């Protein structure tokens, strides 16, 4: 089984022209032998340099966020502007946005709905916090966030949705997630889809692992039955991201 | 009296490549005979096109927002990245950000503090809502927001600060601000500075009018003793912004 993997680089709020251009040069020089989709999410500022400079055909570029429509939202970027600029991929509802920037399950679901409508391929992020994990509410929690999103789509739309699982309870808390844990959460998501949506959609759905991934652990994680790739944080600003790509064969 | 005026275009969350490039062509062709500083605040996405394409030496480009430092803030842009990209001007604490995006007087003051430190010229926005205006709390309100900002600076820093007054109570409420009202609020700000900070700083401080400005009302507003220019919303995406510039002679 297993659909086409995705290796997504999330740069977050990092980067300089010099540093980003060297990393891009690196990517452009990298031989990618299997069928993987590679995704580079840069700051809005860096989207133009990235777009001009990144030439390897296995890479696409993405935005890390947007609001649904244009207008009187000083400092924001809307979906129309991105589309006009030629960006078709977007990350939405990342935990850092849910924690710091006010995004609720319904705001994230609305964004997802809008992007999909405008024809974006969407990487949609879910996951439970330490408190949730501790009280045994992983299933509930994850399932509630996925259902919020699913309430606003139609079966054909799932075609342009990728799910990232974020083990937020393992992110800066001192807890460590293991590949078996990663696989349980992914299998739990996968089943829910097959049931509510359809085994068809379910078998073709990509579920990315959005916890701590590096060149050392990447391969083992990938070896998990329900892991279709990664949404990579810090290792994605380093030459080791190449290794993470290679781990998807 | 009167220092050098500023005519700032705030594009907010608008723009397309085609539309923005035609407007830029327009600006590049415009004869500006007096000493004015013109500022164009585009979405982060459009900063690179703007930077390449805008050539008139009386224009600078600005960002509409940022956070103080780089890191794990998916979807945000920090001050370091902007500076690296060559952007030295920034708008901070716009009412739309205060209303929708959670920005308090202290968050805005912290951003202002950070920008200034990194050497930005800062357009800092203040103003009272309809409720505040109605209960006669204009002075209090405005003075409280300006003091929050002032708590974090030093006298030399004021050198790189521009104050925009936003009559938020006149923004989409059905209320209309008149040039006398604009002038009262500006004079009230100006006095406070002369007192707390120094008549020196006060005489050289630019206070922009951030309400509804167009080619028709621009000139009358400018004619006010304490109005040093405008932070223009919707008319700034139109050919009439040229007229608003001309009104500053």
UniProtKB/Swiss-Prot annotation, chains A, B:
UniProt pathway annotation: Carbohydrate biosynthesis; gluconeogenesis; Carbohydrate degradation; glycolysis; D-glyceraldehyde 3-phosphate from glycerone phosphate: step 1/1
Note: The enzyme contains a high proportion of positively-charged residues in beta-barrels V and VII (compared to the homologous regions in other triose isomerase sequences). Since 2 clusters of positive charges located at precise distances on the molecular surface are common to 4 glycosomal enzymes, it has been speculated that this might represent a signal for entry into glycosomes.
Example of a GO cellular component annotation carried by this entry: cytoplasm
Recorded catalytic activity of this chain's protein: D-glyceraldehyde 3-phosphate = dihydroxyacetone phosphate
Keyword terms of this UniProt record: Gluconeogenesis, Glycolysis, Glycosome, Isomerase, Peroxisome
UniProt-annotated binding residues for substrate: 10, 12
NCBIfam families assigned to the protein according to its UniProt record, in alphabetical order: tim
UniProt similarity note: Belongs to the triosephosphate isomerase family.
Protein name, as recorded: Triosephosphate isomerase, glycosomal
Main location: other
PANTHER family attached to this UniProt entry: TRIOSEPHOSPHATE ISOMERASE (PTHR21139:SF2)
EC number(s) stated in the UniProt entry for this protein: 5.3.1.1
Active site: 94 (electrophile), 166 (proton acceptor)
Subcellular compartments: Glycosome
Subunit organization: Homodimer.
Any GO BP: glycerol catabolic process
Signal peptide: none
GO molecular function: triose-phosphate isomerase activity
Species name: Trypanosoma brucei brucei
């Amino acid at each position: 089984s297993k659909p086409q993997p995705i290796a997504a680089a999330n740069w977050k709020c990092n980067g300089s022209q010099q540093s980003l251009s060297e990393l891009i040069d690196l990517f452009n020089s990298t031989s990618i032998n299997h069928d993987v989709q590679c995704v580079v999410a840069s700051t809005f500022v860096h989207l133009a340099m990235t777009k001009e400079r990144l030439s390897h055909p296995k890479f696409v570029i993405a935005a890390q966020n947007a609001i649904a429509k244009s207008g009187a939202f000083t400092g924001e970027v809307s979906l129309p502007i991105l589309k006009d600029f030629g960006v078709n991929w977007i990350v939405l509802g990342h935990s850092e946005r849910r924690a710091y920037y006010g995004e609720t399950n319904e705001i994230v679901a609305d964004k997802v709905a809008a992007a999909v409508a405008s024809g974006f391929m969407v990487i949609a992020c879910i996951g439970e916090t330490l408190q949730e994990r501790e009280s045994g509410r992983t299933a509930v929690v994850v399932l509630t966030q996925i259902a919020a999103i699913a309430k606003k789509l139609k079966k054909a739309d799932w075609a342009k949705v990728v799910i990232a699982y974020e083990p937020v309870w393992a992110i800066g808390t001192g807890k460590v997630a293991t590949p078996q844990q990663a696989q349980e959460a992914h299998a739990l998501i996968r089943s829910w889809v097959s049931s509510k949506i359809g085994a068809d959609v379910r078998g073709e759905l990509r579920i990315l692992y959005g916890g701590s991934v590096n060149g050392k652990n990447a391969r083992t994680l990938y070896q998990q039955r329900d892991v279709n790739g990664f949404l990579v944080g810090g290792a994605s600003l380093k030459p080791e991201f190449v290794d993470i790509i290679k781990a998807t064969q």
